[PDB]
Ligand binder design. Structure first.
Ligand SMILES: [Fe+3]
Ligand SMILES: [Fe+3]
Lengths: 563, 563
């Protein structure tokens, strides 16, 4: 009762002057309303809870596209906490009427469910992380995290594990870079009211070899019977954030994704060449042209049949030493040089031509070169300007634009476009008619469209999430054109240590064990995959631990059978 | 007989030493084998023939896409030449065995038909012309023209009317510029053996106010019964130059046309905007954006309904004062400035970025800006390089490339890109999402693809020939997408005197009287036409007489009904 529960918290939290001060502070916070309280719970109680958890619970590593976490979601039954009396106590006081009134008041959330408790316990160790998300699930009204690292030592900034908040360009379109970061200590709580479209946050990777324990939880909309229940409130809420969010997603939101998952159609000269060949396959002039980039191993009569058969068998190809030695060395030299001697931008504002940042961060983040005009999305107007003035990729005009920049600034070991120029030449090569003629030979498919990107995934920044291919809307009715996207990836990652996947950066292909391909970055490999609409793909978040970025060239084609 | 026929020609032509000398000369001629003979026929006979024709025959003007000629093809019956005994005589000696042996020998043509005579009589007056063609029809083996201008005065070079020969980049792909020109006198014959793919020639416009009379003719493959008849020769020949030329046309030759008649597909952001609107139509922000270029007359509530109704009625729009006053003046100023103070290239080699020359000349010739990388087709390799490395239009990257040229060379009244920059801004505007939203409103059609070109048709050079629209091959199966190309033309011709069509430059739309539209160049007009596959279009050859080039912006879209 009352006094027994209030005694388990810092006495300050029951003080009206403190409460008003805190409500004001949360009201003035940026980038959206959040709060923090130091030394929330009674020290002894919380020390005990930490002891119980270290002693009573096992934590297993779990990796998805969006997180690596040691969870207990093996020891933990929320309906039987008999062996963990201290935790049971914490859960009772955190959901008590006294605390729910306090918490609802300072966050301006209104009333909170007493019965519907929702907690999980996690540890973050080196490499653990949670990417950008907003917490909008079901009936959640407030998010909190209570932190329990070592009570007798300061958790430092460079340890990582910070709670990071994101400012917003529009509703549902957060900025790529965070504008606030909380470095939490023991017995500190962080919390915010859930804001569909705004409450974007993540957990910064833990960077050093330590264990950060925490209790994550949510307060829910009052349920039927409880204080502050309103009939139809929860269902209105859930409806709005689900079926109708999906409705706004297709109608509007996909427009604010960059790069767009769209392909440009090939000319009739190209398509005719492919067709004729499919219904003395390549000329000598053509092998000569191909041999400038491609290893003779894959251009030989037997290399081809081998690849043809693998593709017919698996609907996929994983080639090694794809490029020849002349190109492999040049690319390795210029890429290593850039990695070791030049500064990589670590903020979207610092990214310059020919590079761009993929957005938004709750879908993806990475640097890419698309051959389009320079774009740096810092405001709504920046975005609308692009959507009004869409342009087409021109890799040659990008080499040109590099020279105007290179000649008005000079060149040096610290600032040059050698890597960019080499990679664009690679891109031009893969856009040539003769390359696609070679692709058509390997696969017996006839490409009818293409998109090429050069991508760089920075350590500690960059990642995609699991998604399906996007069918060319306009072509869906053409029965000759296969219900599939052919997808290529040329990995050009020069550094070592990827093999176990612990550093991230792996390309993952899976069924909606369902894993079809799981390739950590390597040097000069080429994956070709013909995806149906059910196949999911992503590149995993690259860890701060990694010695270089993942560099690749990404290619997509719409295809038709010539029978 | 024999001696009576040989006496009607210059006695030199019967001389073996002359004959061998002439055969050698024809053998050494460029750009393909041709010959000429001064004073071929007996002077008196030819003077008489000239008198008969001036006295006995009327000549009527006839204009097509490819020529303006005063013909007799009213006086002239080849089966009854009783009132023209001298001409009958000429025709008998020109087709005589004696002359056919001589002519067949020097041209290395072999035997020639005696019975199958083929002649026509024409005069070229100011403005008369015949564009690039090769003479390959049916059974023709040798072309000749015999010239009968005024016998007692020199026909000068600047009079025009020269016979011009074209060098070849590949078989069937002549160079845009001629490499030989014959200025003919009275009693001179010009002639060549017919060469499928090579014998390209034209008649230079007559530039001054005079009358050039001539007799054009052909010698044919020997017919059944005649000397040198070979069964199946003629039919092999005809077959090869018809059905199988058409086969090579579709398989290969269209690849060497520039610009290509191809459109790039719009993004899903664009298509969705158009659809939503078609199934408080434009926002104020949108009218504001549109009003920067378009005259308020056409943006008003009633201007729109008016245009909507005209389009539903005719499947076409002809708008006047399309652009507003601010843009109309700027464009007129920069275009007039260029016309009056800068030098226009008059040879494909002299054409510089951002401009290109349409090719080949037996299909079209004009200058255009497509937003693609610079291309100057002087060799086979130039062409194959483009086909291997196709690129996509980027009008913004073309403004960029202009600055690298402009800043390494400086600007002046004699050399600047003001006109080009203004026209590209116009092009960017018409490629914007909001413009196409306006286009969709006028027409109730939803654009799904686009091509834009800025074109300049030089006086004395430039023209297109009557052609059909090209359906997007890839889309033909999509039943939502209309079997039509929407086609726009913004004329920006600043000079006067076009009204009667005598200067050329008119846009002609017709049925395969069949004329649907016939618009001489004017200032700031916009034509919109929805072409089915049967509609033919061309811009007429611009005369040397014209005071400026025809300047326009040309736009094409694939479209779908939203019902
Ligand atoms: Fe969260
Ligand atoms: Fe001719």
């Amino acid at each position: 009762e009352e006094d027994k529960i209030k005694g388990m918290f810092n006495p300050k939290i029951w003080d009206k002057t403190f409460q008003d001060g805190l409500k004001k502070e949360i009201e003035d916070s940026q980038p959206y309303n959040w709060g923090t309280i130091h030394e929330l719970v009674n020290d002894d109680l919380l020390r005990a809870v930490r002891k119980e958890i270290e002693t009573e619970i096992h934590f297993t590593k779990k990796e998805t596209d969006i997180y690596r976490v040691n969870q207990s979601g093996s020891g933990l039954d929320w309906d039987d906490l008999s062996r963990l009396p201290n935790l049971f106590k914490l859960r009772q006081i955190l959901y008590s009427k006294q605390y729910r009134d306090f918490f609802g008041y300072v966050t301006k959330a209104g009333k909170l469910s007493g019965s519907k408790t929702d907690m999980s316990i996690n540890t973050y160790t080196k490499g653990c992380h949670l990417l950008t998300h907003d917490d909008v699930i079901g009936s959640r009204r407030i998010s909190f995290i209570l932190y329990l690292p070592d009570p007798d030592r300061k958790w430092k900034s460079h340890y990582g594990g910070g709670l990071r908040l994101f400012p917003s360009i529009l509703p549902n379109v957060p900025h790529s870079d965070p504008s606030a970061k909380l470095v939490p200590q023991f017995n500190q709580i962080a919390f915010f009211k859930v804001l569909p479209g705004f409450s974007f946050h993540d957990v910064e990777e833990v960077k050093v070899d330590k264990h950060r324990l925490s209790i994550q939880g949510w307060y829910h909309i009052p349920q039927v019977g409880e204080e502050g229940y309103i009939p139809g409130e929860e269902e209105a809420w859930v409806r709005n954030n689900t079926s109708t969010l999906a409705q706004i997603e297709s109608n509007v939101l996909e427009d604010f994704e960059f790069p767009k998952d769209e392909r440009n159609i090939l000319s009739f000269h190209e398509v005719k060449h492919f067709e004729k060949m499919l219904k003395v396959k390549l000329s000598e002039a053509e092998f000569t042209y191909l041999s400038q980039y491609i290893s003779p191993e894959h251009l030989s009569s037997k290399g081809i049949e081998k690849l043809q058969k693998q593709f017919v068998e698996n609907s996929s190809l994983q080639i090694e030493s794809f490029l020849n030695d002349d190109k492999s060395e040049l690319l390795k030299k210029v890429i290593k040089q850039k990695e070791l001697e030049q500064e990589c931008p670590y903020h979207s504002k610092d990214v310059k031509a020919p590079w761009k940042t993929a957005i938004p961060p709750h879908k993806a983040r990475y640097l890419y070169i698309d051959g389009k005009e320079y774009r740096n999305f810092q405001t709504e107007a920046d975005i609308l300007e692009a959507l009004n003035n869409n342009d087409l990729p021109n890799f040659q005009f990008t080499k040109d634009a590099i020279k105007i920049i290179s000649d008005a600034s000079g060149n040096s070991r610290e600032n040059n476009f050698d890597a960019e120029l080499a990679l664009i030449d690679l891109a031009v090569f893969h856009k040539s008619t003769i390359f696609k003629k070679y692709l058509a030979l390997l696969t017996s498919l006839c490409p009818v469209s293409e998109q090429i990107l050069i991508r760089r995934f920075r350590p500690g920044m960059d990642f995609t999430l699991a998604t399906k291919c996007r069918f060319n809307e306009l072509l869906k009715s053409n029965p000759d054109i296969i219900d599939a996207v052919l997808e290529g990836t040329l990995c050009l990652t020069p550094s070592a240590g990827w093999e176990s996947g612990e550093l991230g950066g792996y390309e993952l292909y899976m069924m909606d064990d369902s894993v079809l391909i799981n390739d950590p970055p390597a040097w000069n490999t080429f994956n070709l995959v013909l995806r149906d609409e059910s196949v999911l793909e992503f590149v995993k978040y690259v860890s701060w631990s990694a010695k270089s970025s993942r560099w690749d060239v990404k290619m997509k084609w719409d295809v038709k059978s010539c029978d």
